[PDB]
Amino acid sequence: PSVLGQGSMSTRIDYAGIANSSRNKLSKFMKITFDGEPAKLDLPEGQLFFGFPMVLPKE
Amino acid sequence: DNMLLVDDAINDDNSVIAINSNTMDKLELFRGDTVLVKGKKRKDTVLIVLIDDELEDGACRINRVVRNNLRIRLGDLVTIHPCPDIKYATRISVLPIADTIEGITGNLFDVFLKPYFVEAYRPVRKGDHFVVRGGMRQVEFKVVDVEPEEYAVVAQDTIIHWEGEPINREDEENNMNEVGYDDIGGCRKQMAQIREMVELPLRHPQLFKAIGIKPPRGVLMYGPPGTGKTLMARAVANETGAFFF
Amino acid sequence: RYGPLRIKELAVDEELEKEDGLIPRQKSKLCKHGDRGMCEYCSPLPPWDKEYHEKNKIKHISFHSYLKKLNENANKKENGSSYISPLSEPDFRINKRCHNGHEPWPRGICSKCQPSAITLQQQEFRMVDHVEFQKSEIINEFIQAWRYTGMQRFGYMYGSYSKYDNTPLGIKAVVEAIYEPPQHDEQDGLTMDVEQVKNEMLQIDRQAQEMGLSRIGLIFTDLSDAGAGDGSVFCKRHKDSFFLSSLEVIMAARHQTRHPNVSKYSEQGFFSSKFVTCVISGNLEGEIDISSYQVSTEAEALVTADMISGSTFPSMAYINDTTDERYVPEIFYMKSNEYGITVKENAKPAFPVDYLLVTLTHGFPNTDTETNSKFVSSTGFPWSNRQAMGQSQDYQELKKYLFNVASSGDFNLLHEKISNFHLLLYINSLQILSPDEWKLLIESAVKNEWEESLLKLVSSAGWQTLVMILQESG
Amino acid sequence: MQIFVKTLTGKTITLEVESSDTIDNVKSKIQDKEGIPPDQQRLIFAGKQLEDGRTLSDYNIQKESTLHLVLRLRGG
Amino acid sequence: MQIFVKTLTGKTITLEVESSDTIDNVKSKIQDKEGIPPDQQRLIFAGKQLEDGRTLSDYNIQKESTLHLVLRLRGG
Amino acid sequence: MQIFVKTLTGKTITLEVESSDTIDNVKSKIQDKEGIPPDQQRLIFAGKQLEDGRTLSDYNIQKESTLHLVLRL
Ligand SMILES: Nc1ncnc2c1ncn2[C@@H]1O[C@H](COP(=O)(O)OP(=O)(O)O)[C@@H](O)[C@H]1O
Ligand SMILES: [Zn+2]
Ligand SMILES: [Zn+2]
């Protein structure tokens, strides 16, 4: 389904935008992968987000 | 004034002290007054005052249990002070001495304590002892805990918790801490040095503030092993009444 | 205080403390001694023996056993000290007032009031051992919520604690009912204003206490549907993936810090809240298996001084930066390698949260034992805040639900309909019933020997008015 | 047969009457000794809406049984 | 006589009126201080659908009496 | 006029409407504000359905009152 990466609270907090910025993270004047570096993703008190990309088992 | 002479009391009550009429007049006491009595080793107790002209002026009579609790002997001097702010014991938890209770069947509370506290209003403080003589038996107990702390009057409505495991008697004797200076001899000089170096900073701190100096803190005792260093330290700590650690 | 602290705590703690838990052992074949006299292998096994736990497939040591271990390790009787409290909750916040000659932290610090380096390490003792759901309906309705709406959920779970014989000095939290606060659930996550939640939960918990319950955790569902013909769900939480992402860990730590467990063996009097968090994700297959977790004590005292924030990596938690009013020392997390040597790795940019968790064992009551459920209910009067779905509490549903039973009699049938948690809460909300009348109502609905109390209740004019208005109302 | 009847408040009275006797007889007796018409009286046992049209034998009652009486008062 | 009157929402008001006074008087007072025609006013108590034509002494309502208010349309 | 409503999300929303109109007017106002047509909207006041075939005057809605909104397909 679309919500496994692109759904409600995925557009409110542009997880894709944050991911791309973290990948190309510099002042300097689309796919998400877990090979790179993390970036701070702070949300106020009382908010949960389960939209992180799935990985499935190891098979 | 309040340095009343110790004497053996005729009555067997554990919270009754008989005083002379002259001393009662001097201290403005009256019959039935609950007073705080201090003896030796900083031991304190609460005793109900009863006028008694038989004793010589300046003398008071207390029973064996009270003297044992106060750690004092007959003929000594005890200081008696008013205790008007004593509240009724909301809840007293008390346990017996195992050896005393051996061979007793049934509820000990009803047998001994129920007649002992009802219509008695006996003041009780933690660490005290009271003995009940019932039928052909005599059993001692301990004031394990009192609410409010640390002491209070056991009224008719006061709740008493006698439930709990027996307390071994060996602990009180074989653990004979609170050893006073009388348990150390042959080393009066060093004992005096430690006393003058420890008591005054703790017992009378205002002295050094008046003189405006910082009293010495560290102390280091040394000598051949087996000369009672630990005993001297324990005795000084117990007499000073400080929080020994 | 010249000894152990004096305070009154839960009955479970008292009864557990009374026991010693020693596991007896018989004459081993390797002993060399007569019948009497035990040498080294015949001695009773202490309850904290790690070998027994790891040999019986138990990953943690039943906190009370840990307390026994700590007490035995020190505090000799009759001498050697004047009692030192064995348990102390770690605190990382910088002492705002040390003053060896320096000024407060904002513009001055010494080496005596500098938070030393924190060594993260997996905790070894779990406070609450077994979380137990009384009946399958309690969670079946919760999952039915997601089934109907498709969005996630979140709800506190009230209940009570008790012994747990299956583990040495273990505790189990039996959950009785689930209450759903007003929240804005969504496909990928859920949101809820904290102020409203706490304000509502204060009164709800007051009523629950009146009923004899207690708030003992939070449960939320993280479920996604698979492409199979039937209802199957992916297993996004396994060894490789994240068991609990950063944000849920943070929320659980806050909740624990705000539900302290009163204990007699600490200077402050509290230690390691007995709060359990349950998450529904689905097992390796398509099932809807549940799970339980509890954040360790260090994480409990770590989030209070901020110092942690969520990270785009689900399995790692970001670390904040130093600033006035918030001093963050270097954080070393300690792990073990395949060669049996502990390795300290500095992880400032981000570190996994696997070191801040302890796992509990979920389960259900044996289906061949006595039934002590408080409420034979939870399939009836719709739960509180299901506004998003069609369920809605109001007079009409009461008329449809609890009118014909009362209008005639058959008190045996009535009792079960009156022992529904949400029904009691709603009728109390109406405020129609008088205080004492409601008190006897709850005493009849949550206790046995209820015949006389139920008859008295139906006698009281309050119930007559209730039934009359209910019948009159459409 | 010996039995015990407790009103809603808790006041208790011991009655003697045969098990085969119809409960209407006991209700009339309660009316006579309390002036409470049977319509206001309502007797319950183990959550059963006992009515004047039945006998204790049908309900299977025995001696020293506790019967809870409730006043369906006629003052409203 | 002092009495409580509670509305559907939860508001309660303490009123004074003689028990011998007809309930119509209290309903009219409610109309005065609320502007609610008595037909919409249904006063209830102890499972008694009180009608405007009665008086409290008939219902035996005494001091410190709380009576609930509902509407006859379909409920509150 | 000023009334408060508990929406599906659970928060509180204040709406303004003259108290001499059919409830369908309030339903239209709320749906226009948020985008939830009045076909499935249902309003509950003090735990009682408010049928669309009546205004607020008959119910005599008190000011600063509370309504609750639910959906049903
Ligand atoms: N006045 C005293 N001087 C020295 N030793 C004494 C005295 N009175 C008793 N003793 C005994 O001498 C021993 C003193 O032990 P001590 O040397 O203090 O122990 P430690 O090895 O800890 O210093 C104890 O057995 C004690 O009972
Ligand atoms: Zn052996
Ligand atoms: Zn400092």
Author numbering:
A (entry chain H): 230 to 258, 281 to 310
B (entry chain C): 33 to 277
C (entry chain G): 107 to 580
D (entry chain L): 301 to 376
E (entry chain K): 201 to 276
F (entry chain J): 101 to 173
What did the article's authors report about this structure?
In substrate-interacting and ubiquitin-unfolded classes, all but one D1 domain is bound to ATP, while all D2 domains were bound to adenosine diphosphate (ADP). While the atomic models built for substrate-interacting states only had ubiquitin in UBS1-A (intA, intB), analysis of the EM density for substrate-interacting state intC suggests that ubiquitin can occupy UBS1-B prior to ubiquitin unfolding. Resolved interactions with a distal K48-linked ubiquitin bound to UBS3 (models uD and intB) involve an Npl4 helix composed of two conserved glutamates followed by mostly aliphatic residues. The conserved glutamate Glu557 is positioned within hydrogen bonding distance of the backbone amide of Ala46 in ubiquitin, while Leu561 interacts with the hydrophobic patch of ubiquitin around Ile44 of the most distal ubiquitin of the K48-linked ubiquitin chain observed in our structures. In addition to interactions with the UBS3 helix, contacts also emanate from an Npl4 loop between residues 514 to 518 and include hydrophobic contacts between Phe517 and ubiquitin Ile44 as well as polar contacts between Asn518 and the ubiquitin backbone at amino acid 47. Structural differences were not observed between states that did or did not have density for ubiquitin at UBS3, so we posit that in addition to ubiquitin interactions with the Ufd1 UT3 domain, UBS2 and UBS3 interactions with tandem K48-linked ubiquitin molecules anchor the chain at positions distal to the substrate while proximal ubiquitin proteins are unfolded. Other major differences observed between resolved substrate-interacting and ubiquitin-unfolded classes are the orientation of the tower relative to Cdc48 and the positioning of Npl4 residues 437 to 451, which forms a loop atop the Cdc48 central pore where substrate enters the hexamer during unfolding. In unbound and substrate-bound states, this loop is positioned over the central pore where it could clash with substrate as its being unfolded.
